[PDB]
Amino acid sequence: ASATRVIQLLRNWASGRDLQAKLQLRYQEISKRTQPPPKLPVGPSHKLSNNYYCTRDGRREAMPPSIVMSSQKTEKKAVTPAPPIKRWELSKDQPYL
Amino acid sequence: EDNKQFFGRHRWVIYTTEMNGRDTFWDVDGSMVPPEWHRWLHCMTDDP
Amino acid sequence: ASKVKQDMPPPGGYGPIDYKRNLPRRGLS
Amino acid sequence: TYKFVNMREPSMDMKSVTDRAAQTLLWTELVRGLGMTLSYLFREPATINYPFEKGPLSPRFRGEHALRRYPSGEERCIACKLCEAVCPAQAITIEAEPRADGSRRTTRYDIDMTKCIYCGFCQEACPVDAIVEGPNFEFSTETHEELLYNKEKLLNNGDKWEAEIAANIQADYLYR
Amino acid sequence: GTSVKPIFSRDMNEAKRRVRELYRAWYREVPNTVHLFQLDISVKQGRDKVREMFMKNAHVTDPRVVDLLVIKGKMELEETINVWKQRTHIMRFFHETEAPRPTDFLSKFYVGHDP
Amino acid sequence: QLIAVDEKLDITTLTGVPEEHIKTRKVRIFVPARNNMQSGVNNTKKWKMEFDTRERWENPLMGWSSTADPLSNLVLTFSTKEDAVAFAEKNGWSFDVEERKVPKPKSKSYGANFSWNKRTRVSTK
Amino acid sequence: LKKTTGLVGLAVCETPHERLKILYTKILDVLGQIPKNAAYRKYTEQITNEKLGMVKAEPDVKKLEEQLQGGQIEEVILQAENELSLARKMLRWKPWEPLVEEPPANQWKWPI
Amino acid sequence: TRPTIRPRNDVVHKQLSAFGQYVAEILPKYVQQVQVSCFNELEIFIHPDGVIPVLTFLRDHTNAQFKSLADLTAVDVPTRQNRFEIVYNLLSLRFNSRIRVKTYTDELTPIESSVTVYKAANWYEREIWDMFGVFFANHPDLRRILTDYGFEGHPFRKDFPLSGYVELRYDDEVKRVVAEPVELAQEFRKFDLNSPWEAFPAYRQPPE
Amino acid sequence: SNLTLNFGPQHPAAHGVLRLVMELSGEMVRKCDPHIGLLHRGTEKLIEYKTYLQALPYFDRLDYVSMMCNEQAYSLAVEKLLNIQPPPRAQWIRVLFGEITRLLNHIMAVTTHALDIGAMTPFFWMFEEREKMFEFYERVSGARMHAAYIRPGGVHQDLPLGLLDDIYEFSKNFSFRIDELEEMLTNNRIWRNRTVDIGVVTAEDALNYGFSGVMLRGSGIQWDLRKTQPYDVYDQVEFDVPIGSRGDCYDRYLCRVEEMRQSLRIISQCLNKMPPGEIKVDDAKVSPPKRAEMKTSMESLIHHFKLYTEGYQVPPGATYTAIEAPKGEFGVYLVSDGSSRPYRCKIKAPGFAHLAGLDKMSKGHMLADVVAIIGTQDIVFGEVDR
Amino acid sequence: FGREDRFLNYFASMRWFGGVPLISLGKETVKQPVYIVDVSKGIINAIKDPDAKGKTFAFVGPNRYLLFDLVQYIFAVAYRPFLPYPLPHFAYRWVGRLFEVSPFEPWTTRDKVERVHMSDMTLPHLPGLEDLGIQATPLELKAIEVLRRHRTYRWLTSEMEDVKPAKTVNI
Ligand SMILES: COC1=C(OC)C(=O)C(CC=C(C)C)=C(C)C1=O
Ligand code: SF4
Ligand code: SF4
Numbered sequence A: 001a002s003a004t005r006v007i008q009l010l011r012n013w014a015s016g017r018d019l020q021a022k023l024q025l026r027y028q029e030i031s032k033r034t035q036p037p038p039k040l041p042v043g044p045s046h047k048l049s050n051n052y053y054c055t056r057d058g059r060r061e062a063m064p065p066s067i068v069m070s071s072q073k074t075e076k077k078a079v080t081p082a083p084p085i086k087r088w089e090l091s092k093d094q095p096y097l
Numbered sequence B: 001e002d003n004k005q006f007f008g009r010h011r012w013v014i015y016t017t018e019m020n021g022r023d024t025f026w027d028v029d030g031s032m033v034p035p036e037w038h039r040w041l042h043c044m045t046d047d048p
Numbered sequence C: 001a002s003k004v005k006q007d008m009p010p011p012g013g014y015g016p017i018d019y020k021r022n023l024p025r026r027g028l029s
Numbered sequence D: 001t002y003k004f005v006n007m008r009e010p011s012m013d014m015k016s017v018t019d020r021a022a023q024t025l026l027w028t029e030l031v032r033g034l035g036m037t038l039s040y041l042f043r044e045p046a047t048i049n050y051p052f053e054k055g056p057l058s059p060r061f062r063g064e065h066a067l068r069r070y071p072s073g074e075e076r077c078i079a080c081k082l083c084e085a086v087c088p089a090q091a092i093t094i095e096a097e098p099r100a101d102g103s104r105r106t107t108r109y110d111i112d113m114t115k116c117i118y119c120g121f122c123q124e125a126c127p128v129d130a131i132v133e134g135p136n137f138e139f140s141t142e143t144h145e146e147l148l149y150n151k152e153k154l155l156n157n158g159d160k161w162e163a164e165i166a167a168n169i170q171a172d173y174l175y176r
Numbered sequence E: 001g002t003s004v005k006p007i008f009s010r011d012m013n014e015a016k017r018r019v020r021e022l023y024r025a026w027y028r029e030v031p032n033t034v035h036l037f038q039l040d041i042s043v044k045q046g047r048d049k050v051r052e053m054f055m056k057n058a059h060v061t062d063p064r065v066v067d068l069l070v071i072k073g074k075m076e077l078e079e080t081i082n083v084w085k086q087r088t089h090i091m092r093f094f095h096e097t098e099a100p101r102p103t104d105f106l107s108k109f110y111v112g113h114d115p
Numbered sequence F: 001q002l003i004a005v006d007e008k009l010d011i012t013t014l015t016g017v018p019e020e021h022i023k024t025r026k027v028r029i030f031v032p033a034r035n036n037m038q039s040g041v042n043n044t045k046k047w048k049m050e051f052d053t054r055e056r057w058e059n060p061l062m063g064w065s066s067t068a069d070p071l072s073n074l075v076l077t078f079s080t081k082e083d084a085v086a087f088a089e090k091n092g093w094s095f096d097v098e099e100r101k102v103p104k105p106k107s108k109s110y111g112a113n114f115s116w117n118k119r120t121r122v123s124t125k
Numbered sequence G: 001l002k003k004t005t006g007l008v009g010l011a012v013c014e015t016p017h018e019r020l021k022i023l024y025t026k027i028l029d030v031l032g033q034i035p036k037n038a039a040y041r042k043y044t045e046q047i048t049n050e051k052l053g054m055v056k057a058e059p060d061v062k063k064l065e066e067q068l069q070g071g072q073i074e075e076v077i078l079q080a081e082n083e084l085s086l087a088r089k090m091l092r093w094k095p096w097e098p099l100v101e102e103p104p105a106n107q108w109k110w111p112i
Numbered sequence H: 001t002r003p004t005i006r007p008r009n010d011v012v013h014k015q016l017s018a019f020g021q022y023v024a025e026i027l028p029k030y031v032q033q034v035q036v037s038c039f040n041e042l043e044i045f046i047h048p049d050g051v052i053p054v055l056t057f058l059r060d061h062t063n064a065q066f067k068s069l070a071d072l073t074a075v076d077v078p079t080r081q082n083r084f085e086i087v088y089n090l091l092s093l094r095f096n097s098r099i100r101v102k103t104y105t106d107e108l109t110p111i112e113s114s115v116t117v118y119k120a121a122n123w124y125e126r127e128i129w130d131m132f133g134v135f136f137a138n139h140p141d142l143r144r145i146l147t148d149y150g151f152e153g154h155p156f157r158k159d160f161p162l163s164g165y166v167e168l169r170y171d172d173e174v175k176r177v178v179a180e181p182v183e184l185a186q187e188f189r190k191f192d193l194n195s196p197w198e199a200f201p202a203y204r205q206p207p208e
Numbered sequence I: 001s002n003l004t005l006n007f008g009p010q011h012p013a014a015h016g017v018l019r020l021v022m023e024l025s026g027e028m029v030r031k032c033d034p035h036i037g038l039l040h041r042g043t044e045k046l047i048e049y050k051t052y053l054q055a056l057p058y059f060d061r062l063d064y065v066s067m068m069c070n071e072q073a074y075s076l077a078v079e080k081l082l083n084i085q086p087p088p089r090a091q092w093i094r095v096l097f098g099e100i101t102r103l104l105n106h107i108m109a110v111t112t113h114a115l116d117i118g119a120m121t122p123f124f125w126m127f128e129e130r131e132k133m134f135e136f137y138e139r140v141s142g143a144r145m146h147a148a149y150i151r152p153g154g155v156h157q158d159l160p161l162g163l164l165d166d167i168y169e170f171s172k173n174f175s176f177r178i179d180e181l182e183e184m185l186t187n188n189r190i191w192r193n194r195t196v197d198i199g200v201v202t203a204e205d206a207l208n209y210g211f212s213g214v215m216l217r218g219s220g221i222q223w224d225l226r227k228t229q230p231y232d233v234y235d236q237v238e239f240d241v242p243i244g245s246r247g248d249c250y251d252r253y254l255c256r257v258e259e260m261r262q263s264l265r266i267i268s269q270c271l272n273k274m275p276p277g278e279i280k281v282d283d284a285k286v287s288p289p290k291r292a293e294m295k296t297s298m299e300s301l302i303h304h305f306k307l308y309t310e311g312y313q314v315p316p317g318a319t320y321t322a323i324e325a326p327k328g329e330f331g332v333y334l335v336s337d338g339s340s341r342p343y344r345c346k347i348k349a350p351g352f353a354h355l356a357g358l359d360k361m362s363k364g365h366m367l368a369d370v371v372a373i374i375g376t377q378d379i380v381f382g383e384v385d386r
Numbered sequence J: 001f002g003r004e005d006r007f008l009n010y011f012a013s014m015r016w017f018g019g020v021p022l023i024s025l026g027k028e029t030v031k032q033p034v035y036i037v038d039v040s041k042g043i044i045n046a047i048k049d050p051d052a053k054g055k056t057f058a059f060v061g062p063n064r065y066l067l068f069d070l071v072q073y074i075f076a077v078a079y080r081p082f083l084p085y086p087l088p089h090f091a092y093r094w095v096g097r098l099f100e101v102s103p104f105e106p107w108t109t110r111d112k113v114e115r116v117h118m119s120d121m122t123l124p125h126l127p128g129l130e131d132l133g134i135q136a137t138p139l140e141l142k143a144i145e146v147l148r149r150h151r152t153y154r155w156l157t158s159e160m161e162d163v164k165p166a167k168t169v170n171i
Helices: A005-015 B035-041 D014-026 D028-041 D082-086 D121-125 D151-175 E012-036 E043-056 E063-081 E087-091 E105-111 F081-090 G016-031 G039-056 G061-068 G073-093 H010-026 H048-060 H121-132 I043-048 I052-062 I067-082 I088-117 I121-141 I163-185 I189-195 I203-208 I249-272 I298-309 I350-356 I367-376 I381-385 J008-017 J036-047 J067-077 J089-099 J110-117 J144-150
Strands: A066-070 D002-004 D065-067 D092-098 D104-112 D131-133 F026-030 F047-051 F056-058 F065-067 F075-078 F094-097 H031-036 H042-046 H068-076 H084-092 H097-105 H166-171 H176-181 I003-007 I019-025 I028-035 I241-243 I317-325 I328-336 I344-348 J020-022 J084-086
Touching: A005 D028, A066 H010, B035 D151, D014 D028, D028 I121, D028 I163, D065 D151, D082 D092, D082 D121, D082 I298, D104 D151, D121 D131, D131 D151, E012 E043, E012 E063, E087 H176, F026 F081, F047 F081, F075 F081, F081 F094, G016 G039, G016 G073, G039 G061, G039 G073, G039 H010, G061 G073, G073 H048, H010 H031, H010 H042, H010 H048, H042 H048, H048 H084, H048 H097, H068 H121, H068 I317, H068 I328, H068 I344, H084 I328, H121 I350, I019 I367, I028 I367, I043 I052, I043 I344, I052 I067, I052 I381, I067 I088, I067 I317, I067 I328, I088 I121, I088 I163, I088 I189, I088 I249, I088 I367, I121 I163, I163 I249, I189 I249, I189 I367, I241 I249, I249 I367, I328 I350, I350 I381, J008 J020, J008 J067, J008 J144, J020 J067, J067 J084, J067 J144, J089 J110
Parallel strands: D002 I241, F026 F094, H042 H097, J020 J084
Antiparallel strands: A066 H031, D065 D131, D092 D104, F026 F047, F047 F075, F056 F065, H031 H042, H068 H084, H084 H097, H166 H176, I003 I019, I019 I028, I317 I328, I328 I344
């Protein structure tokens, strides 16, 4: 910024922090508006052989849902939809704000 | 241009006072910029 | 057929970024 | 992993109690807020001087539509109607027939700009780079009818803005 | 048997009783609607319009359909009483800006192709 | 318990459809004909219900195509003819049903291309 | 001993072992009126018996919370109350009876 | 097979299948079917009469604890004798799981309101009533939520036209907003997109 | 009788188009009746009339404060129904822009909440940061907010060559702006008076009413979809979930500020770990080929033609896919009949359930308290009305 | 007469002077006012009528009123106190002269005063609104939509069937 040093001191005393270190306005550290051209690699299916589509066809591996207990058609331990969720841990970085 | 100003105020245009037929001393609008200077002024490129 | 050029982080990495709250005490008793 | 935001307990010693009493009776945190506003008062504002100064844009910006030509002057559009098929707003209307020289060209190319959502799907779908979203965004009108573009208006836009459109396409086509 | 379950009414008698209660409520409400919405119509016009709406669905012979119609009518009455409707909503029943369309064959032949 | 209604299903009073678009409409229930430009048959499996075509006119300002009937784009899909008939009946629409057209089985013989005494022998391959 | 369970509206329970014992005994009493061959009765009796057994075998609340894997024993008490209410409702409903009114022929056929 | 294809998880598939069998065993009176999709989603198809019991079980059971109703909506399939398909999506935070419960109804059959089980249902059912015309019995306050006041019809039905039957404008003679039959300067253009060649052999239907 | 008042739709504190019919005794609020549908555009039927690619821009306009998050949720649902997998670089870009979008949304929510309560300055301070993030959006997609950038194959385009540096430059300074906003609000006694113990909701009531996101976390419920049900690469980043203890407006405000800080943390991690490679799935029957290939090879041109005219077919089936959007759980129930157009698409908006609980939350409060409670629920009516 | 007319509004606005000056107390003037929508519909139907090429029409309302009774009804619909007093013709002409001097739209003019006091002609030989398919709307069904604006807050909600329609000198 172009502010005089007295105004910088007044700003830093009023805010309580050094404002000149982290300015809202960006001056010259941003990227140039003209950039060199890119190259952009291709991908994993760009091989010349051993690349038949039937071996990499995700849509064709979808199938109708599995049927359990159609109505038309002992040990027996109880079950849950999934194992119980494990209790969260308390933030080794900063547990309390 | 003035590269010491922050981004957005570092480039500007002073419009002409007389475009095709109308007096533009007071009435100016952003559509008076031709496309090449339009590309430069909106920072879509660095080269004027 | 030059080297692949893509938008990538610089060699090594970026500098650390502050995110924690910073409210100094800044007062008399 | 989780953290608490509001689970602290103040100190109950005479020093802390008197500090809290002073804060209550002398308005310390309000003074801190006033100091923050005073600090913002002496900073340079972020306002730009429109229209003499403009907001920053990129070559990818989607704006007013245009129809383009080959360097010979021949139109690029060959009336495949891919843009018409893909348009999410049904904003494009195309009619075509064989030209006098046997060419495949349009007799009608309409874009309703009050239907359009400016998504740029038409320019992605186009196989010859005929229809583009230009860089212009200052084209407000006084009537609804001026925003119903026909082929003549779009060709005029292309001839008007090609000098910038070609440079913008040059900067981004390697990403496409 | 056809094995169908009711909504509220068991047969057409209870359905007719509910219809009569709804009609009584609408008939009572009409003058308040004329006053509150500041309508330029008369109370007689509003009650005739109420009567007309009921007559339209008079032909229905199914108690479930009658029950659903009564539910919809109660919803409409609730909208009117609480002034959730505006003046335009109330006046939409009268079709004041729609030009009349003749039902005779000659008039339809002259204007267009629609039957 | 149950009430045992003995009436015919009729929901026209509850659908919100204007009277004109109930009594004056004719719906067609049919299996769509295969597009003759292609050999695929996957578009000839389901039953379709569609409405009778009404007037279209040119827009004065841009010459666009303008319509006044709201059912010009309504097309319904059904598994069987009976399902479409039931839907049309309960919605009060009068309908025309066309029976499904299935190509008849044919007798193909590659050897017949080279018959000793029949007209089926081909003069070119 | 513990304060502020951490969930708004959930108060801290003193003497939770006794409360859990009462709740599990009530659940078992209610389940005793359901037919023996019903699946709900046997499944609920099994799980409730495991929970009661682990309750009677641990006097420390933190370790009991760890063993039950139920998330903060106050929520265990709440879940026990919910289970007792559900058991009463199911006794009223009797959902172990055979299926009523098989669906139409192609009710669940997709696509179309 | 590796890079472009979504990987599948078999542990979750087995667990969801076991829990579906569990629910079907506990409630044979209402459960008509149980399915596990191949992207690991579990659905339970029930008779309508069991809307309240089943949900209650899933909400309060110790082993289920599905205490959050994520969504409740309807699907309209005109080719079915029971037109409307009612779908409940439930989430269990205790077991970090999701379940789907499905039932059916027609235009004239009420479905019991589930507001007593989940408060969140209150608005959802209203929306279902507004968009599809399905009535919910014992609803505390059932009325339109999304449509304009006095709107006629249920727009989310398949036979309801896309642009509707009426349109609004301002009339200066009566000095107010009025409604008139729809007239479109440009008719919406119907596209016929389906390919005449079959895409997915795994879903082929028998030729009847 | 009580006085009946129309709060909105033409009201500064109505957050757009909302007709709050209030029954009041003096300024005590006896009853709140929210009337919605003033922004109901019939999105779901329109989607029924589009291909899967054509329907994507509707999700930009559902929650027009968090666009790329809705794009991500819809793309994930379509990917699940397609049985395909986005490439790693696309997923990292998705998470980075999702966190940037969360920053945008939280700025909007907190600043407009303060504006409604009566503090106007932080709005102005933070909307410059919003404008810089809009510039990031435009540089990646050409549009400031309705990007249509995240698609069921990954992302439309790769990053421009200088974008990561500018994102890093913004991120290394955003924490001081958060600090200034906190200095304005957090310890102010007027702010605490207007927020503390206002709109208290219990954990059980929050669960039964269908709440999600911060509306749960403020009441102590330890739930977050990025931690319990991660979707793209959220299992490879480290962050904390802020939890409240009072269930009031003040705790939710603190939670949102802390979530902004955690978003900065995640953005740092995403910037450091961006991998190389392609940005959409290498499967031309789903993702369109590159322009150079489309103008060179027959198969590429055929697939481009078919993907832009008819669109890809999706195998039949139904999914419910949910994400931790900045406003809570955002979900899609998507049904496919096997064709290129979805049969049914139900959108689940957290604001729907949150606004449905407004009457419960306002019991025993005043008009200004109800304004604060409206602000604390973080409501946008594009997603509520759909 | 209509919402933006100079007939009902003109008489309603005369309450600002406290009393209504009427030449001969308005007892020797007969009026046959016609509704605005009837006139507009008649113009439209004349456009669409092939037989109306060189015809001369007379658009009048269904009832004829003495001026005193019409003004009394106008003041009753507006719920304003009616204080009619007789003014000589030359004095009213002087008032019109005085008001004509306005550089803006005059409140009244001498010509306007003359027209107000002149009886409506009867021309039975000319065709009318009924010959164009229009049933003339009486003033009794449309006065409230014009005169409700001229009421105070106390009388704003009064319904249209309250104000006892005025007497007509018909045949
Ligand atoms: C400070 O002045 C302003 C307002 O007045 C308080 C506004 O309402 C608004 C609109 C935003 C609110 C949420 C209504 C804006 C943008 C504004 O700048
Ligand atoms: S930008 Fe999008 S909406 Fe506009 S014309 Fe192109 S495809 Fe259609
Ligand atoms: S503009 Fe392009 S996509 Fe559209 S019809 Fe012309 S060539 Fe085809």
